[PDB]
């Protein structure tokens, strides 16, 4: 701008983040526990013990 | 009788060992389509170690399989080593040897027991190897199929379990005979 003259921006932008699209993750061993949180499983174990 | 049961046990041990060695050495486990076939890809028949192209310009050439996330790494290692089918074959061999010894040291009755334990453990190891193989093949190129080597492994598993049953029955009969003879004496 010190040596030329600009116009008002015709397109405003900024820095941003590019990532690879999340894919269907390869199922993990012990993915059969995913429907319930770990805390539920531990409470189940200790309720079994207590009962 | 006892003799025929022992004969069946030894025959089954030999047959299962042979089938499993054949399946391990053989390279006809999986029929699929692969990118590295010189033209989604070309037909291939694979195994545990090497893969061979069929119906292609590079027909008949067989090349070592290029394997390669901690769990994925461990699975790849176990699949590459194929330690579980090999262990199954080794345990079958040792069980057959123990049976042959039982054909000599007729007094020691805790031998035809080790044979049965080894046969059952071999069946379990074969199950594990099959699971590992199937899991590792999958990734994330269709209409794939399994060959006669895979079913040789399955037959080996079935035979091993059967002969383990027979060996345990033999141990039962022998221990019962000895115990009844002793108590009545």
UniProtKB/Swiss-Prot annotation, chain A:
It is found in: Cell membrane; Postsynaptic cell membrane; Postsynaptic density membrane. Detected in forebrain. Detected in dendrites of neuronal cells. Expressed in the pyramidal cell layers of CA1 and CA3 and in the granule cell layer of the dentate gyrus. Induction: Down-regulated in the pyramidal cell layer of CA1 in the hippocampus by global ischemia. The gene is Gria2. Belongs to the glutamate-gated ion channel (TC 1.A.10.1) family. GRIA2 subfamily. This is Glutamate receptor 2. The chain crosses the membrane at residues 38-51. It comes from Rattus norvegicus. Palmitoylated. Depalmitoylated upon L-glutamate stimulation. The lineage of its organism: Eukaryota, Metazoa, Chordata, Craniata, Vertebrata. The chain holds residues 507 to 557 of 883 of the full protein. Ionotropic glutamate receptor that functions as a ligand-gated cation channel, gated by L-glutamate and glutamatergic agonists such as alpha-amino-3-hydroxy-5-methyl-4-isoxazolepropionic acid (AMPA), quisqualic acid, and kainic acid. L-glutamate acts as an excitatory neurotransmitter at many synapses in the central nervous system and plays an important role in fast excitatory synaptic transmission. Homotetramer or heterotetramer of pore-forming glutamate receptor subunits. Tetramers may be formed by the dimerization of dimers. May interact with MPP4. Forms a ternary complex with GRIP1 and CSPG4. Interacts with ATAD1 in an ATP-dependent manner. ATAD1-catalyzed ATP hydrolysis disrupts binding to ATAD1 and to GRIP1 and leads to AMPAR complex disassembly. Interacts with GRIP2. Interacts with GRIP1. Interacts with NSF via its C-terminus. Interacts with CACNG2, PICK1 and GRIP2. Interacts with GRIA1 and SYNDIG1. Part of a complex containing GRIA2, NSF and NAPA and/or NAPB. The M4 transmembrane segment mediates tetramerization and is required for cell surface expression. The postsynaptic actions of L-glutamate are mediated by a variety of receptors that are named according to their selective agonists. This receptor binds AMPA (quisqualate) > L-glutamate > kainate.
Curated annotation (Swiss-Prot), chain B:
The keyword Transmembrane helix applies. The keyword Cell cycle does not apply. One of its GO terms (cellular component) is dendrite membrane. Palmitoylated. Probably palmitoylated by ZDHHC3 and ZDHHC7. One of its GO terms (biological process) is regulation of AMPA receptor activity. The chain crosses the membrane at residues 4-24, 81-101, 111-131, 152-172. It is found in: Cell membrane; Postsynaptic density membrane. Keywords: Calcium, Calcium channel, Calcium transport, Cell membrane, Ion channel, Ion transport, Lipoprotein, Membrane, Palmitate, Phosphoprotein, Postsynaptic cell membrane, Synapse, Transmembrane, Transmembrane helix, Transport, Voltage-gated channel. GO terms for molecular function: calcium channel regulator activity; channel regulator activity; ionotropic glutamate receptor binding; protein phosphatase 2B binding; voltage-gated calcium channel activity. Belongs to the PMP-22/EMP/MP20 family. CACNG subfamily. Interacts with CACNA1C. Identified in a complex with the L-type calcium channel subunits CACNA1C, CACNA2D1 and either CACNB1 or CACNB2. Acts as an auxiliary subunit for AMPA-selective glutamate receptors (AMPARs). Found in a complex with GRIA1, GRIA2, GRIA3, GRIA4, CNIH2, CNIH3, CACNG2, CACNG3, CACNG4, CACNG5 and CACNG7. Interacts with CNIH2. Found in a complex with GRIA1, GRIA2, GRIA3, GRIA4, DLG4 and CNIH2. Regulates the activity of L-type calcium channels that contain CACNA1C as pore-forming subunit. Regulates the trafficking and gating properties of AMPA-selective glutamate receptors (AMPARs). Promotes their targeting to the cell membrane and synapses and modulates their gating properties by slowing their rates of activation, deactivation and desensitization and by mediating their resensitization. Does not show subunit-specific AMPA receptor regulation and regulates all AMPAR subunits. Thought to stabilize the calcium channel in an inactivated (closed) state. This is Voltage-dependent calcium channel gamma-8 subunit. The gene is Cacng8. The chain holds residues 16 to 240 of 421 of the full protein.
């Amino acid at each position: 701008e010190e040596v030329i003259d600009f116009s008002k921006p015709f397109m405003s932008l900024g820095i941003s983040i590019m990532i690879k699209k999340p894919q269907k993750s390869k199922p993990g061993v012990f993915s059969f526990l995913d429907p319930l949180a770990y805390e539920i499983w531990m409470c189940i174990v200790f309720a079994y013990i207590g009962v | 009788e006892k003799g025929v049961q022992v004969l069946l046990t030894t025959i089954g041990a030999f047959a299962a060992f042979g089938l499993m060695t054949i399946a391990i050495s053989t390279d006809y486990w999986l029929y699929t389509r692969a990118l590295i076939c010189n033209t989604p890809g070309g037909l291939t028949h694979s195994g545990l170690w090497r893969i061979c192209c069929l119906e292609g310009l590079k027909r008949g050439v067989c090349v070592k399989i290029n394997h390669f996330d901690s769990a994925e790494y461990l699975l790849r290692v176990v699949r590459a080593s194929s330690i579980f089918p090999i262990l199954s074959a080794i345990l079958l061999l040792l069980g057959g040897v123990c049976v042959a010894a039982s054909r000599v040291y007729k007094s020691k009755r805790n031998i035809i027991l080790g044979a049965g334990i080894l046969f059952v453990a071999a069946g379990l190891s074969n199950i594990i190897g099959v699971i590992v193989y199937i899991s590792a093949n999958a990734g994330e190129k269709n209409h794939y199929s399994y060959g006669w080597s895979f079913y040789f492994g399955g037959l080996s598993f079935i035979l091993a379990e059967v002969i383990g049953v027979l060996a345990v029955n033999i141990y039962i009969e022998r221990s019962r005979e000895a115990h009844c003879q002793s108590r009545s004496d």
